[PDB]
Amino acid sequence: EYDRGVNTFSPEGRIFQIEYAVEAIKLGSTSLGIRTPEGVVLAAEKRVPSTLVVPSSMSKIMEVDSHIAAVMSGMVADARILVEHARVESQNHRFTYNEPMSVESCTLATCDLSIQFGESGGRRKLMSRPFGVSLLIAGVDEKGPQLWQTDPSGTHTRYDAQAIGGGAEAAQSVFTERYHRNMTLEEGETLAVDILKQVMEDQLSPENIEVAVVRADDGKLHMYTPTEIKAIMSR
Amino acid sequence: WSPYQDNGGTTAAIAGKDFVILAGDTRLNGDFCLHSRHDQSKIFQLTPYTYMASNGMQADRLQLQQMLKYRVKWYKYNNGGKVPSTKAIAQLMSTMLYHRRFFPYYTFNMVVGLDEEGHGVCYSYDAVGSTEPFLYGTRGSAASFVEPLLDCLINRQHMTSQAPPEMTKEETLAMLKNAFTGAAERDIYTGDSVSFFIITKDGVQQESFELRKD
Amino acid sequence: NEYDSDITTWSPTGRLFQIEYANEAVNNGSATVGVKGKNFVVLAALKRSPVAELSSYQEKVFEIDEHVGMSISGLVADGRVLARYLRTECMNYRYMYSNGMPMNQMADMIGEKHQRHIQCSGKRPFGVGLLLAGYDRQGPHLYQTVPSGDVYDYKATAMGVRSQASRTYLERHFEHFSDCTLDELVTHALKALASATSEGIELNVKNTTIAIVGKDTPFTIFEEESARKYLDGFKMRP
Amino acid sequence: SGHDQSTDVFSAEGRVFQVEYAGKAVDNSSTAVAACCKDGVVVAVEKVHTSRMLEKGSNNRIHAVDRQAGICICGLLPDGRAIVSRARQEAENSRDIFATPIRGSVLANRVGEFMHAYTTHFAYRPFGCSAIIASYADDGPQLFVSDPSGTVAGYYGVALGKAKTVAKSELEKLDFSSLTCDEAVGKLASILHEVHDKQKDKLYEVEVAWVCDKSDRKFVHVPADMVPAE
Amino acid sequence: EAFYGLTTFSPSGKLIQIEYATTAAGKGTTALGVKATDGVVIAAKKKAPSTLVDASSIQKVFVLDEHVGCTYSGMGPDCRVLIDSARKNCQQYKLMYNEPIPISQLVRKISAIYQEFTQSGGVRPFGCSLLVAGVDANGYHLYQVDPSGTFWAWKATAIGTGSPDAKAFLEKRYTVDMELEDAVHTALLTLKEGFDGQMTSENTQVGRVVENRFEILSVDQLRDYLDQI
Amino acid sequence: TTTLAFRFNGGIIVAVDSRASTGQYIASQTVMKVLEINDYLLGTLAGGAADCQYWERVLGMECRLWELRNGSRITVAAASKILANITYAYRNHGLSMGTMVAGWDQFGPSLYYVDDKGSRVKQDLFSVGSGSIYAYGVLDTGYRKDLSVEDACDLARRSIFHATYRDGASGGIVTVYHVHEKGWTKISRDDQTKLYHRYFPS
Amino acid sequence: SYDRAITVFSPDGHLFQVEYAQEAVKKGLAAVGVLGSDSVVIAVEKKSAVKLQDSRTIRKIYKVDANIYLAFAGLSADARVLINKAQLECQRFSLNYEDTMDVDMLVRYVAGVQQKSTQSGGSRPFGVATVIGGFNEDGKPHLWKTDPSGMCSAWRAVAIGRHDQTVIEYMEKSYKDGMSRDECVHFAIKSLLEVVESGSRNIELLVLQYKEARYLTEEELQKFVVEVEKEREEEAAAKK
Amino acid sequence: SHRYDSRTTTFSPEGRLYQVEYAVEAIQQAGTVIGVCTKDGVVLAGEKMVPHPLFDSESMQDKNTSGEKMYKIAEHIGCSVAGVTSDAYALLNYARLSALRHQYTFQEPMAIEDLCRILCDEKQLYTQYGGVRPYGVSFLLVGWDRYYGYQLYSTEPSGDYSAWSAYAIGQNDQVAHALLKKDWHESMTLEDGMLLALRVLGKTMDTAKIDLDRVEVAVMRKVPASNIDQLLDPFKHHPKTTPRFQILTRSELKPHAERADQAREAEEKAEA
Ligand SMILES: Cc1nc(C)c(C(=O)Nc2ccc(F)c(-c3nc4ncc(-c5ncccc5C)cn4n3)c2)o1
């Protein structure tokens, strides 16, 4: 329906398109992110459409840089372009300033694109709609391990433990407890895998999901292979 | 009419263990006259631990200083108040110098600052941006005077005498004063008064030193 | 009601309904209170509280230059669009005239930048209100911008959700601000701000930002670390 | 129906409804009044404060456009700011291209022309503000008014705002042939206090400007101690 | 700037905007044209809105160049656009080929604007049907373009209000071996038969192309035939 | 400037001097001519130091982007074509750079030379620079495929040392890099005069 | 120019234009591509042999690159305009890098175009879902599938076109890992024919091996369709 | 304004593009034209409107390029149009420009399948951008090339094209379909092909004793090459025979018309 435009305001003040695009997020796969003094952890459920897909092609966890990972939810068609944008901006920040970009700067550079929607072209070409995707960036820079979140609004927010996608409501319930500030990375592993176990219709299998971890001292991104996830489930 | 001009002057830095001594002569000369003897537009402070000292054309360095200052301010605003490091500033300046490659800046630059482990390092650029990190270095019309002198008292090559102890702030300051008093007596365009900047960890201090006014 | 479909449509009563809706976006943002003294201006913003172990942190206070600063309320995804522009313009001005842009000129710039977006079809008004805080030759200035494009030079103001109580407090002490000193200014601002929070919530270092800008003082933000000088001793004494 | 939704639609009787709705929004704004006193012009506007913490000098509606011409925008303040900026771009050109101060009537013509280029297109909305241009060029004192319709007209004494009829009935009885600005700054200022209702808005204040020979033919704000107290 | 299309297909497959435009292009004054082995004759009817219209200045037979004429029936203000572009395309041809443009190319060029407006963005179709006539290297021609963009190579036609009867009369009084003056006479005669009063030298306007050129008839020349029919 | 790299059974060997002369004055004796693009490619700097540094840094950004997107390391044949296109686009803007990209992709080792006019050749023996004419002489007469890694490194070091000794535009510190299937390692880095009393003793 | 937003969010968070394109896909001709051990095969529905189409052959599996073949499902004209873009991209890639485009990069570029369509002004999404098969320059057969939504994904035996879920969920429980070259041609027919009419002249098959892709001729296809129908009728006699 | 946007290029709830369906239903009322692809030529036989007593023909010199229904696109490509007449001319000019630019670039006659694709991409382009109505016209291209000999393609007002051996578009085209697929064999000469055409044409507009004012025929075959001036490019091999598209007058159709109605009465006498 096209009665109200792409830029109209609702009587409650929130733009219609961004209010609808946030609703499309709860239709996607869930995802997590836990920040800890040792590192940050990103867990997600691939939610394959069939048993035939080679699952390593629908990786919900994309590497943006050797120290910056990003997990998404919603419609994974757009999130790929946000990730290419973050990769280009991070490589530029390494080419110009000769040092790893800061995670908050990557999130800023992502929202800077995600806001540029409208209809009247004129000078610059715009997006005809917001991205129906809520990213989740995690990384390790000098400010320690950091987890940032992004909405289709263009609004970036630093967190400590967040959940996006469908089963995020009960995920925040599991969050309010079972999470102190100074946990161990293994504790984060157990907690995240438990959450995934709790809020998914499928059965948690080492090939079903995907987990990535970024450790502080190493300072590198370390995507887990199914066997390592099996090692976590066996605990 | 050519859009270029050389306003003489010279600068020279020596990096130590936990400090850097930067020095620039305060003298500005035009075509054939002498504009000023109190020119302080050589050494420009970017961040509390980083400076850029440039020679050559004066308008070009007054322009490049503002471009670098605004790039530093953008970096500070995007990174939540994180003042950039010397390494980042030096790479940024090389990138900036090469963008104006076809109508270049007529400056020869040095980005003098402190590294992360505390050690001090200097950088040196060409007109187009060939950076090279090093421990001392002079630029300007008085380069070929001061450089071989420092080469001989710091590197201590060609002397069969065990290496002396590591030079401190006062000793390095005195050595650089020697170099400038010697270069003010054989170069016609150099020296009315030099300004020294001692960059340490607990801030920076500043001193002046007076030369011959001929 | 079919006269709110566009920003370029006048209701039979001469009303722009899209802008009256955009004002509801400001009337639902996080509360902020600004207080202007004789030589200092103090902004106090109420950020989001931690959920018993976890701290969500979002930037509401911005620094625009050495002497300026702004606290936004409403949709932040517009506050950044405006802060980038204000920073760019204060830099373009400090590059030409090598001195800080006067507030009486920056407020007009913000007003025009807003108005340019409420007169075409393919646009929409910024659903964000600003609290500008500055100091220049003429002394401290505290403005407040709305979505419609207006700018108001205030003596003391407050905006955001349930900011009416903050204003009801401020409209008793706003006559003595030209004499209260810095600590007294920040205390008035915090007392006015804590009068807009929920019932069982009180002010503490976890959910408050304090920005200050004055004569010999560049714009300094204050978060948890040094907010305690103004925040650790603080009671909402009725 | 839909015949009153865009500016490019003539009604069945040849009326552009959107501009009538625009003028309806000016009919509800703060009061303004102005007098062309054969040796100068005096504009005086009512500022209705919604808040008693507002610094004096905020929301001033009288803006200088050249040395000698000024604009008082009765109506929507943001749109008046756009018109003031356009008049400033028009007055600086004649001072730049043509080395001469812009004549008052030409400025009024240009401001009207610009206000009317917004009531022809389907993608714009008419300005919600009526301008009062007070100029004193080498052609004598001039007082013009521009409505959101884009129509300009020169007056001897003009009244705008919510209370426009009773405040205009005051200007009929002034002389305007022997009236001097030095007394008009009292007369018009008192007219606004007489017409102003005070059981609706608890906060109001009168701000008046003038351009005559005493101010070196320059549009300035009145000296503070020249407006009667109430 | 309203870049979308106004005319669009309908469930029945009709560009119904074009049907409205072709009805609007048949309400104007009646014009007609006939052919003969020696030349073409165009005859319009200057319906004066009032006695204060200066019948000298209103014109319905437009010269396009030394060899082409035209007349319309519909919205005059629309036909001005097509005449102004047709003269330009007739001069651009003489500029590049140094030869009087043949009629067929002229009609293909101006029938390309009808179609460009029935398929552009934010514009409505034209509402005037032309009657082009003239000479080229391969004889005399009389075409009749339409708002939909089509064109036809008639031999004797009539457009406007009162066309279905004017063409009926033309079916009967036409002859395959007509000389030129016969054509002028029959044009004026079928205009009179449909004329509401009696036509004067300033109530009509004819143009007859003879052997190299169009040459709109003057007032005295047009009179010399009016008082002889 | 003197730069050389030759291919043998065991990998690729790069070797450089470390001096940058501005006409007749020696700017520095520690310029780093081998710009390690990534952990698998080696590019060398010859000609304009600004141009080479900048464009090889751009190429090291583009190889990293390629790896990020596809998830596989870039190959030498494609990493060398990027630089050839970059250089060929500016063939009429006055660049001055001749570089050598040497890598070990999934097709064994490859060594390309990319010029300042877009030239791009693939041979197993290169020596660019102003003292290059002194390397070839000592390089062509000792080079053969089946050299041991130390014997070939010695050939490269003794070949750069003879270019530093006869040429005024080369000298300083001779440095030798080795490119094998696991990556690359800096073999040695020695002063040009301590070599003189090591090759011609007494 | 005309750039009004067409694909906008519905009051439930559903892109009506994308769902409507994915509906126009379901009304097309099927296409079943399976992945074998050392060769990948693709089968297309070849609408009919109407005794009126030119006796000359025209193929329905399009050669996007010397080693990458494509088979679409949906609207035919948009399918051709997408194949042309892909063929231009392969040849630009093997001009900026001297290296033949892998399959995966081509799938990513085509999915990028698909997605850019659903976020541009004045353009509706392409109504095509494609299966892209091929070999890298080191063997490694790859088989990918894109959607009008732009979400590409690598499969092991995929079907597109009408009755999509039926064929997929049938041949997922009858796919053995690591089939032979003559297994695939039997497994491609036996699964595709579960949706097509028994007519043997509306099937067009392609086998694709390392550096060799040849189409299976009429009698070659008959030899296998008879074996397939016999196995199916045997499975039926086993059902009852 | 954006409220009166008809939105031509949108997907309807059932993936159907309404405007393209309406264009198809528009073409159905246009004139029927059929085209049969024989082994030594290809024929296009269509029906043009009833001749008013006052119609004239533009006295065109060299009348072999444009008839009332069939047109020439290049020396070896003819086409026939069905649908909105004045819209077909824009695409016809575009196709002429395309089939001339390829000959400017490559100096070889463009093959039918290349052009048929290059002017169907244009017809599709409007179905996806611009937001304006699509070209509501359908083609029949016939021509000869060294790649596949006599070809014959057919076009939809949606960009898709298909190669046919004998096709028909316009009024009652479902009838001519069932009639052409009824009788067409590979071993059919050109003159027997033409007999098949008119025969099934008269049946589609229901005329016994076919008429010669309401029919238009255009044949595309190879004639022996004509202007071979080998002495002006001694290294240019000119083929011995070149294709020539030719439109039939009254003097040369009447012989083929009297045999068509004679075959009609032949296959009519044997109905009892
Ligand atoms: C396969 C192969 N075989 C050879 C022999 C080469 C080769 O020569 N390639 C090459 C390409 C571009 C260049 F730009 C250069 C190049 N190298 C230089 N070294 C030093 C100075 C220099 N420096 C300071 C002062 C004066 C001078 C002359 C200048 N150049 N220019 C060399 O390639």
The answer to whether the CB atoms of G119 and A132 lie below 8 A apart is: no
Residue D179 DSSP label? -
The answer to whether the CB atoms of A75 and G151 lie below 8 A apart is: yes
CA B140 to chain CA centroid, Å, is 9
Q: What per-residue string of b and e applies to C64-85 under the rule 16 or more CB within 10 Å gives b?
A: bbebbbbbbbbbbbbbbbbbee
For residues B111 and B52, the answer to whether their CB atoms sit within 8 Å is yes
Contacts with E52 (C-beta within 8 Å, 6 or more apart), sequence order = none
DSSP secondary structure of chain H: --TT---SS---TTS--HHHHHHHHHHTTS--EEEEE-SS-EEEEEE-----TTB-----SS-SS--SSEEEEETTEEEEEEE-HHHHHHHHHHHHHHHHHHHHHHSSPPPHHHHHHHTHHHHHHTTTSTTS----EEEEEEE--TTTSSEEEEE-TTS-EEEBSEEEESTTHHHHHHHHTTS--SS--HHHHHHHHHHHHHHHHT-SS--SSSEEEEEEEEEE-----GGGSTT----SEEEEEEE--HHHHHHHHHHHHHHHHHHHHTT-
Question: Distances from the Cα of C78 to the Cαs of A103, C124, C126, C163, in angstroms?
Answer: 21, 11, 6, 21
Which residue, B51, B54, B22, B31, is CA-closest to B41?
Answer: B54
Ramachandran region of residue E70, left (φ > 0), alpha (ψ -120 to 50) or beta? beta
What sign results for the dihedral spanned by CA atoms C219, C225, C230, C235? positive
Q: Report the domain count for chain D.
A: 1
- Measured CA to CA, the distance from residue C209 to residue C186 in angstroms comes to 11
In degrees, rounded to 5, the angle at the alpha carbon of residue G100 between the alpha carbons of residues G97 and G104 is 105
Ramachandran region of residue D155, left (φ > 0), alpha (ψ -120 to 50) or beta? beta
Q: How many residues does chain C have?
A: 238
User: In the 3-class helix/strand/coil scheme, how is chain C assigned residue by residue?
Assistant: CCCCCCCCCCCCCCCCHHHHHHHHHHCCCCCEEEEECCCEEEEEECCCCCECCECCECCCEECCCCCCCEEEEECHHHHHHHHHHHHHHHHHHHHHCCCCCCHHHHHHHHHHHHHCCCCECCCCCCCEEEEEEEEECCEEEECCECCCCCECCECEEEECCCCHHHHHHHHHHCCCCCCCCHHHHHHHHHHHHCCCCCCCCCCCHHHCEEEEEECCCCCECCCHHHHHHHHCCCCCCC
Contacts with H212 (C-beta within 8 Å, 6 or more apart), sequence order = H250, H253, H254, H257
CA-based diameter of chain A, in Å?
A: 59
Which residue, B79, F67, B118, F37, is CA-closest to A141?
Answer: B79
F1: annotated active-site residue: yes
Element containing residue B210 per DSSP (H, E): strand B204-210
Helix E180-192 vs helix E219-226: angle between axes, to the nearest 10 degrees? Answer: 80
For residues A138 and A69, the answer to whether their CB atoms sit within 8 Å is yes
Question: Distances from the Cα of A71 to the Cαs of A21, A116, B30, H21, in angstroms?
Answer: 18, 22, 60, 43
The answer to whether the CB atoms of B70 and C91 lie below 8 A apart is: yes
For residues H82 and H138, the answer to whether their CB atoms sit within 8 Å is yes
Q: Report the domain count for chain H.
A: 1
Q: Report the domain count for chain B.
A: 1
For residues A46 and A208, the answer to whether their CB atoms sit within 8 Å is yes
For residues C231 and C205, the answer to whether their CB atoms sit within 8 Å is yes
Q: How many CA atoms lie within 13 A of H131 on its CB side?
A: 22
Q: Is D184 helix (H, G, I), strand (E, B) or coil?
A: helix
Element containing residue B159 per DSSP (H, E): none
Written as one letter, the residue type at A155 is T
Whether residue D204 lies within 8 A of chain C, CB to CB, comes out as no
In degrees, rounded to 5, the angle at the alpha carbon of residue F3 between the alpha carbons of residues F2 and F9 is 145
Distance B123 CA to ligand 1 centre (A): 25
The answer to whether the CB atoms of H131 and E3 lie below 8 A apart is: yes
Q: What per-residue string of b and e applies to E72-110 under the rule 16 or more CB within 10 Å gives b?
A: bbbbeebbeebbeebbebbeebeeeeeebbbbbebbebb
Find residue F174's DSSP bridge partners: F190
> Starting at the edge strand that comes first in sequence, how are the strands of the sheet with C139-142 ordered?
C61-62, C70-74, C128-136, C139-142
Q: How many CB atoms lie within 10 A of CB B192?
A: 21
- Measured CA to CA, the distance from residue E82 to residue D145 in angstroms comes to 43
Question: Distances from the Cα of B61 to the Cαs of B42, B56, B104, E100, F109, in angstroms?
Answer: 8, 8, 12, 68, 46
Which residue, C189, C227, C192, is CA-closest to C206?
Answer: C227
Distance F109 CA to ligand 1 centre (A): 24
Joined together, the tokens standing for residue G25 give 């896909």
User: How close does chain F come to B66, measured CA to CA in Å?
Assistant: 22
Domain that holds residue D3: 1-230
Written as one letter, the residue type at H45 is A
Which residue, A223, A84, A29, A50, is CA-closest to G154?
Answer: A50
Per CB-CB distance under 8 Å, the chain B contacts of C59 are: 80
- Measured CA to CA, the distance from residue A86 to residue A92 in angstroms comes to 10
Helix A185-198 vs helix A169-176: angle between axes, to the nearest 10 degrees? Answer: 140
Whether residue B155 lies within 8 A of chain F, CB to CB, comes out as no
**Closest CA to ligand 1's atom 7:** F128
What sign results for the dihedral spanned by CA atoms C184, C189, C192, C197? negative
Q: What per-residue string of b and e applies to C99-127 under the rule 16 or more CB within 10 Å gives b?
A: ebbbbeebbbbbbbbbbebbbbbbbbbbb
Is any ligand 1 atom within 6 A of the Cβ of residue F47? yes
Joined together, the tokens standing for residue C210 give 């304090």
Written as one letter, the residue type at B71 is R
Give the β-pairing of F25-28 and F20-22: antiparallel
Tokens 């199914």 found at: A226
Burial of residue H201 (number of CB atoms within 10 Å: 0-12, 13-18, 19+)? buried
- Measured CA to CA, the distance from residue C82 to residue C93 in angstroms comes to 16
Question: Do H and G make contact, counting contact as 3+ CB pairs within 8 angstroms?
Answer: yes
The answer to whether the CB atoms of G4 and E4 lie below 8 A apart is: yes
The answer to whether the CB atoms of A96 and B95 lie below 8 A apart is: yes
For residues G33 and G208, the answer to whether their CB atoms sit within 8 Å is no
Written as one letter, the residue type at G2 is Y
Q: Report the domain count for chain F.
A: 1
> Starting at the edge strand that comes first in sequence, how are the strands of the sheet with G39-44 ordered?
G157-160, G31-35, G39-44, G204-209, G212-215
Residue D172 DSSP label? G
Domain that holds residue F31: 1-202
Residue D214 DSSP label? G
Find residue F22's DSSP bridge partners: F25
Mutate to test the interface with B, among C60, C92, C94, C96 (most CBs of B within 10 A): C94
Element containing residue F12 per DSSP (H, E): strand F11-16
Joined together, the tokens standing for residue A94 give 């390494």
Q: How many CB atoms lie within 10 A of CB D194?
A: 11
Find residue C42's DSSP bridge partners: C35, C212
Q: Which residues of chain F come before a gap where C and the next N are over 2.5 Å apart?
A: none
Q: Is B35 helix (H, G, I), strand (E, B) or coil?
A: coil
**Main-chain dihedrals φ then ψ at residue H180, nearest 5 degrees:** -80, -40
Atom of ligand 1 nearest to the CA of F47: 14
In degrees, rounded to 5, the angle at the alpha carbon of residue B161 between the alpha carbons of residues B158 and B164 is 105
DSSP secondary structure of F98-147: -EEEEEEEBTEEEEEEE-SSS-EEE-SEEEEESSHHHHHHHHHTT--S--
Tokens 């086993």 found at: G238
- Measured CA to CA, the distance from residue D226 to residue D44 in angstroms comes to 12
- Measured CA to CA, the distance from residue A90 to residue G76 in angstroms comes to 40
- Chains in contact with A, where contact means 3 or more Cβ–Cβ distances below 8 Å, are B, C, F, G
Joined together, the tokens standing for residue C26 give 């400001």
- Measured CA to CA, the distance from residue A74 to residue A28 in angstroms comes to 4
In degrees, rounded to 5, the angle at the alpha carbon of residue F159 between the alpha carbons of residues F158 and F164 is 95
Element containing residue F59 per DSSP (H, E): helix F49-70
Q: Is E62 helix (H, G, I), strand (E, B) or coil?
A: strand
Assess if residue H13 is contained within a domain.
no
Whether residue D22 lies within 8 A of chain C, CB to CB, comes out as yes
- Measured CA to CA, the distance from residue C68 to residue C105 in angstroms comes to 12
- Measured CA to CA, the distance from residue H18 to residue H28 in angstroms comes to 16
Contacts with G113 (C-beta within 8 Å, 6 or more apart), sequence order = G82, G85, G126
Per CB-CB distance under 8 Å, the chain E contacts of G2 are: 3-4, 121
Give the β-pairing of D62-64 and D152-154: unpaired
Ramachandran region of residue D115, left (φ > 0), alpha (ψ -120 to 50) or beta? alpha
User: In the 3-class helix/strand/coil scheme, how is chain A assigned residue by residue?
Assistant: CCCCCCCCECCCCCEHHHHHHHHHHHHCCCEEEEECCCEEEEEEECCCCCCCCCHHHCCCEEEEECCEEEECCECHHHHHHHHHHHHHHHHHHHHHHCCCCCHHHHHHHHHHHHCCECCCCCCCCCECCCCCECCEEEEEECCEEEEEEECCCCCEEEECEEEECHHHHHHHHHHHCCCCCCCCHHHHHHHHHHHHHHCCCCCCCCCCEEEEEEECCCCCEEECCHHHHHHHHCC
Q: Is G27 helix (H, G, I), strand (E, B) or coil?
A: coil
- Measured CA to CA, the distance from residue H193 to residue H38 in angstroms comes to 6
For residues A29 and A73, the answer to whether their CB atoms sit within 8 Å is yes
* CA-based radius of gyration for chain A: 18
Q: How many CB atoms lie within 10 A of CB E10?
A: 16
Is any ligand 1 atom within 6 A of the Cβ of residue F120? no
Burial of residue H255 (number of CB atoms within 10 Å: 0-12, 13-18, 19+)? exposed
Is any ligand 1 atom within 6 A of the Cβ of residue F116? yes
Helix G103-117 vs helix A76-97: angle between axes, to the nearest 10 degrees? Answer: 110
Which residue, A32, A47, A31, A57, is CA-closest to A204?
Answer: A47
Joined together, the tokens standing for residue D59 give 């929301």
- Measured CA to CA, the distance from residue B75 to residue A111 in angstroms comes to 17
User: How close does chain A come to G156, measured CA to CA in Å?
Assistant: 5
Contacts with D177 (C-beta within 8 Å, 6 or more apart), sequence order = D38
Q: How many CA atoms lie within 13 A of E163 on its CB side?
A: 21
Per CB-CB distance under 8 Å, the chain G contacts of H166 are: 52
For residues A185 and A203, the answer to whether their CB atoms sit within 8 Å is no
- Measured CA to CA, the distance from residue D128 to residue A214 in angstroms comes to 57
Contacts with H89 (C-beta within 8 Å, 6 or more apart), sequence order = E108, E111, E112, E115, E149
Q: Is D161 helix (H, G, I), strand (E, B) or coil?
A: coil
Best mutation site among F25, F132, F167 for ligand 1 pocket (most ligand atoms within 8 Å of CB)? F132
- Measured CA to CA, the distance from residue E65 to residue E215 in angstroms comes to 10
Helix C164-173 vs helix C182-193: angle between axes, to the nearest 10 degrees? Answer: 150
Is any ligand 1 atom within 6 A of the Cβ of residue F169? yes
What sign results for the dihedral spanned by CA atoms A32, A35, A38, A40? positive
H helix runs in chain E, sequence order = 16-24, 76-97, 103-117, 163-173, 180-192, 219-226
- Measured CA to CA, the distance from residue D165 to residue D191 in angstroms comes to 12
Q: What is the resolution of this structure in A?
A: 3.4
Which residue, F8, F10, F94, F87, is CA-closest to F43?
Answer: F87
- Measured CA to CA, the distance from residue C188 to residue C170 in angstroms comes to 8
Give the β-pairing of F11-16 and A136-141: unpaired
User: In the 3-class helix/strand/coil scheme, how is F62-86 assigned residue by residue?
Assistant: HHHHHHHHHCCCCCHHHHHHHHHHH
Q: Which of B66, B77, B80 sits opposite C87 (nearest CB)?
A: B77
Question: Distances from the Cα of F180 to the Cαs of A30, F38, F114, F187, G203, in angstroms?
Answer: 44, 14, 21, 12, 52
For residues A22 and A171, the answer to whether their CB atoms sit within 8 Å is no
- Measured CA to CA, the distance from residue H179 to residue A206 in angstroms comes to 63
Domain that holds residue C112: 1-238
Ramachandran region of residue E134, left (φ > 0), alpha (ψ -120 to 50) or beta? left
Element containing residue D199 per DSSP (H, E): none
Q: How many CA atoms lie within 13 A of H221 on its CB side?
A: 16
For residues D50 and C23, the answer to whether their CB atoms sit within 8 Å is no
Q: Which of G96, G99, G104 sits opposite F75 (nearest CB)?
A: G99
Which residue, E121, F70, D196, H272, is CA-closest to A87?
Answer: F70
Which residue, A201, A150, A179, is CA-closest to A41?
Answer: A179
Joined together, the tokens standing for residue H183 give 């009788």
User: How close does chain G come to E2, measured CA to CA in Å?
Assistant: 8
For residues B94 and B64, the answer to whether their CB atoms sit within 8 Å is no
Structure-derived torsion over alpha carbons of residues E17, E23, E28, E30, reported in degrees to the nearest 10: 140
Contacts with D159 (C-beta within 8 Å, 6 or more apart), sequence order = D31, D32, D33, D167, D168, D170, D171
Written as one letter, the residue type at B129 is G
- Measured CA to CA, the distance from residue G126 to residue H155 in angstroms comes to 20
CA F80 to chain CA centroid, Å, is 13
User: How close does chain G come to F121, measured CA to CA in Å?
Assistant: 13
* CA-based radius of gyration for chain C: 18
Which residue, C82, C72, C65, is CA-closest to C116?
Answer: C82
